[PDB]
Amino acid sequence: PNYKLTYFNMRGRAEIIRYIFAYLDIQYEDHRIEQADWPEIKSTLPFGKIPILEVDGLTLHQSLAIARYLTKNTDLAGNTEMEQCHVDAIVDTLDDFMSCFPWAEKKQDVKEQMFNELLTYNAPHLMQDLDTYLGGREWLIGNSVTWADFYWEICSTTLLVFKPDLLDNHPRLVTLRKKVQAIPAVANWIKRRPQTKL
Amino acid sequence: PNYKLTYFNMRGRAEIIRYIFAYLDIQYEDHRIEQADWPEIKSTLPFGKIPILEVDGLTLHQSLAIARYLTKNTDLAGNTEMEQCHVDAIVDTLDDFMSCFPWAEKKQDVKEQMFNELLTYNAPHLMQDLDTYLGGREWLIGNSVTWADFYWEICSTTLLVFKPDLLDNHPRLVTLRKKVQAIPAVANWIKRRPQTKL
Numbered sequence A, B: 001p002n003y004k005l006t007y008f009n010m011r012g013r014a015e016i017i018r019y020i021f022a023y024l025d026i027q028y029e030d031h032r033i034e035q036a037d038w039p040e041i042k043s044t045l046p047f048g049k050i051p052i053l054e055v056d057g058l059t060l061h062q063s064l065a066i067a068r069y070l071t072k073n074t075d076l077a078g079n080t081e082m083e084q085c086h087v088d089a090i091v092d093t094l095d096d097f098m099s100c101f102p103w104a105e106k107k108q109d110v111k112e113q114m115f116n117e118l119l120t121y122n123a124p125h126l127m128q129d130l131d132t133y134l135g136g137r138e139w140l141i142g143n144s145v146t147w148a149d150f151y152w153e154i155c156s157t158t159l160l161v162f163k164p165d166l167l168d169n170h171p172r173l174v175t176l177r178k179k180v181q182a183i184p185a186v187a188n189w190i191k192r193r194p195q196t197k198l
């Protein structure tokens, strides 16, 4: 099966998919577009949003729907039906927060305001909830790595760009990040991927 | 299993779970709370949000994570892995849009203006995408009903409270609502359920 992933030249919402392809050792075309090219592609898409994944002439959309599809019947999914629910719940909780940021805001003063509010007021409480949820366990769900751990690592990486001191009082969440980053397939991708801010 | 759903006295984010329970003929306690008992329960919740589902003492959160868990290994989920991806993608698309509305805004004039803005520009754009995606086909995904159809009907029911003429130029989306509402288990629930605005 031939895979083509289309997104902007960033980690962003597409990176979870990039991690999953790397972990499962699946070859794919990593198509990165400029904003100048986007409107022409946008107009042809059913819902006009990216990332999209083309699989055998069939265009999938929604990053987490795609991530779930790719991890289905693999070791990145939950090991029980209930664990799969916990995986989906943690990912959605993270996705809910990341989606609050006005990534596409053109007015800089309004953008900086919102980022500062979310990072200063809201982010610390999410960290507290995540840290308590993890407890003293090795991974977020179950006894082995899932794509929820991937998603945590990806979200936290972007948050740390704007607020470097986010996990100062959360050593266990730092440990989880480093374990995800230590997985060979993930480590390899982290080193070779295009180095962008977001 | 012993199920207990906790949410406000409204359809809201919980209604998709209530539809699935009714369609699959699965018994559960539909616990509806007032504002008075929310702070007490909120403290016991790992992530401080509802709906939540308690399954034999084990708590679950995130409405769509719970919905997907309940539809596991049924035809409601989608027949193939690819269809299940389409189902997930449509639901997330609808959920993304419904999440844009300022449901908890206390400034009534601000709320009015933001609702009007979303219903005038964004809603019609999404409706055209949904309508063309459905085409002249019977259901949104595949040959039979999925919980994506349920979710469309639920979301559109709330949207029609604020803009009654939203689907007046989309007869195919009106037809889809009617088909879902006519499903015996859904028809029974819609008659039974408490009457609320949202």
Ligand SMILES: CN(C)CCCC(=O)Nc1cncc(-c2cccc3[nH]ccc23)c1
Pocket: A008, A010, A011, A012, A013, A035, A095, A098, A099, A103, A104, A105, A154, A155, A158, A198
């Ligand atoms: C052209 N520019 C204005 C558009 C670029 C959009 C952008 O910066 N996307 C972006 C950048 N960083 C994070 C997310 C994001 C949003 C929601 C959930 C997410 N999860 C991981 C990243 C992520 C999204």
Ligand SMILES: CN(C)CCCC(=O)Nc1cncc(-c2cccc3[nH]ccc23)c1
Pocket: B008, B011, B012, B013, B095, B098, B099, B103, B104, B154, B155, B158, B198
């Ligand atoms: C005053 N406050 C305590 C009540 C706020 C509850 C409320 O109005 N929630 C609500 C009401 N109507 C729709 C949604 C909603 C939000 C996001 C995705 C959704 N999908 C279906 C409903 C829905 C949520």
Ligand SMILES: N[C@@H](CCC(=O)N[C@@H](CS)C(=O)NCC(=O)O)C(=O)O
Pocket: A012, A013, A042, A048, A049, A050, A051, A061, A062, A063, A064, A103, B092, B096
């Ligand atoms: N919930 C969707 C959201 C996708 C989305 O909104 N993507 C943004 C970029 S991060 C986009 O397409 N922006 C360009 C546009 O809206 O025209 C997902 O996770 O895929």
Ligand SMILES: N[C@@H](CCC(=O)N[C@@H](CS)C(=O)NCC(=O)O)C(=O)O
Pocket: A092, A096, B012, B013, B048, B049, B050, B051, B061, B062, B063, B064, B104
């Ligand atoms: N993505 C979550 C969002 C849940 C959510 O935010 N629910 C609202 C009520 S509809 C809530 O509990 N808000 C927290 C609060 O204001 O106390 C889900 O779908 O379950």
Ligand SMILES: [Mg+2]
Pocket: A092, A095, A096, B092, B095, B096
């Ligand atoms: Mg979501």
